Amino acid sequence: NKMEAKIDELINNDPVWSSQNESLISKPYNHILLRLNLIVQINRVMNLPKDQLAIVSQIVELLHNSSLLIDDIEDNAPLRRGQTTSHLIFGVPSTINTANYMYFRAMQLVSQLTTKEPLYHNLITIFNEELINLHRGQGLDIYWRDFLPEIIPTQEMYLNMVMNKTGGLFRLTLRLMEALSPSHSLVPFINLLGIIYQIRDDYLNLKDFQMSSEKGFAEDITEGKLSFPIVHALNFTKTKGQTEQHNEILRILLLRTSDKDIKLKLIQILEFDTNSLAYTKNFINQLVNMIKNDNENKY
Amino acid sequence: KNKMEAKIDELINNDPVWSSQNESLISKPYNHILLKKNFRLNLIVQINRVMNLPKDQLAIVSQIVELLHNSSLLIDDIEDNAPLRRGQTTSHLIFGVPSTINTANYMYFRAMQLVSQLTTKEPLYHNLITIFNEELINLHRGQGLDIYWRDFLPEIIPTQEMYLNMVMNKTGGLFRLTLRLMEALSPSHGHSLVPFINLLGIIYQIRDDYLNLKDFQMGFAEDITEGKLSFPIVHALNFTKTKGQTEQHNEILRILLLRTSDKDIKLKLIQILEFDTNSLAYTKNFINQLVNMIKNDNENKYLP
């Protein structure tokens, strides 16, 4: 009976959870803690009170930092922001759980943006839709990389995955803001910005290695990722009939090598053989021009 | 310059592109575990006898539960480095850890979208999202504490109480989630059945822990390989500690820390549990006491 009593108290109450415990499972997340400027610039247009902007901001940082914990497991990364990745320190298991834990903490902050039922309903739908999109882009990015060469994505395919994957968070922040704006839509512009952002990340990952084997590590090659330059090189070589080059590119990616000279041979293949690096640079300026060269404010 | 801008223009002005083919690719890890219910759907069907939801609504709740459950297994298996799930090879060993994690997470939000099709009644919908959000936070708290104890062993040796609060959260979360949504949707229903569903969740987990050691002794006893702080183990470790049985307490710990697949060694542990601590007999008596609170609930305190 003393057991059955202690048990009756257990089941007739909320599940117990201390802050000691909160601390123990937040380890992976706190470690990565060791944007915004953008949210501020856009708010000049949305005019959200500071209190509400703060929450939108905490929400995005929670989803973002969490994404990195996961992406680093998925991409098998050893370094983020210059430190060892959380999963290498605390393990893949805790990191997955903590990161997924944070997704829901973020969802939980949404009920603090409003007390109005209809408005709340739209913030949840937005949250849910963009998260579904983020996983869709990420899903494809991982599939192409891991089942290569089952699928050699074209430039258009890569661009759509980028819309979902990177455009996803950009759109979630904006759409939340537009829905809260007490005050055309900026989504298209934010979509373009996300694309510019992802192709630039892809680009610099290799450029900061071709210039200094101590500026970047061209980790993307190690991961075997189908970056923008890589997608350009694989299609270019197939189209120009460069079978050997096409195949050597695949081989190097499939190796998942940390060899600096092998990574540098691939970067130079993109440099002189396929001109993927020039192509990517020029593609980035063109995308930026669409913006800088918009006097009619269509963006 | 000009045709490339035309295409980028079309691209950024449209919703993100997604095909049915892409959906198949992203679902492979999921559809793979589907080849594994009429016992999860059974309890839902019986409980509806008390909640009386319109069938199609009941189907949605149902679909939501298959998604969360199945996706949780995809992740638990990665998290527990399990080679087998219900007989076949786990998805992460076939499709890889990356796709598996992502596909399971993708399903979490798919399940969340289903929730907003259970009703459009603004008030009610908020209670459904709160419930969903609340139980997923709890499930993750339980899961995180179970993983922590296992991966940090022997830093913290949980007590029985501790193991039970962890269970309320972990396993009880999906049970409560289902129940609470059903109850909030109910058109009818007496006292809340959460307490009963909580007790049901505890029985289920401990039963799971017990059977995993007992099906081996009679089941590969994977829980030993994983180094999991199960109910019998939590009992063996505290019992031995309390009896100042130093060398057995340590031998238990050495074996769990071996993360071994050696049947001889897994057996050496099961025997410490039978002959030294009697943890298996003790776990058995515990499940029985828990079930008796149900079989002897003439007052209908927990039962409907």
Ligand SMILES: CC(C)=CCC/C(C)=C/CC/C(C)=C/COP(=O)(O)OP(=O)(O)O
């Ligand atoms: C926002 C959110 C909750 C997302 C959940 C799904 C998820 C893990 C998305 C990945 C987000 C992302 C763009 C990571 C970095 O991309 P990358 O692969 O190029 O990695 P890098 O930043 O190191 O270049």
Ligand SMILES: CC(C)=CCC/C(C)=C/CC/C(C)=C/COP(=O)(O)OP(=O)(O)O
């Ligand atoms: C419901 C949901 C969305 C969950 C997501 C988070 C997650 C990984 C939950 C696992 C829940 C659970 C009790 C799994 C099995 O327990 P176990 O560790 O004893 O493993 P086993 O049941 O295979 O023996």
Ligand SMILES: [Mg+2]
């Ligand atoms: Mg990455």
Ligand SMILES: [Mg+2]
């Ligand atoms: Mg990535």
Ligand SMILES: [Mg+2]
């Ligand atoms: Mg498990």
Ligand SMILES: [Mg+2]
């Ligand atoms: Mg587990």
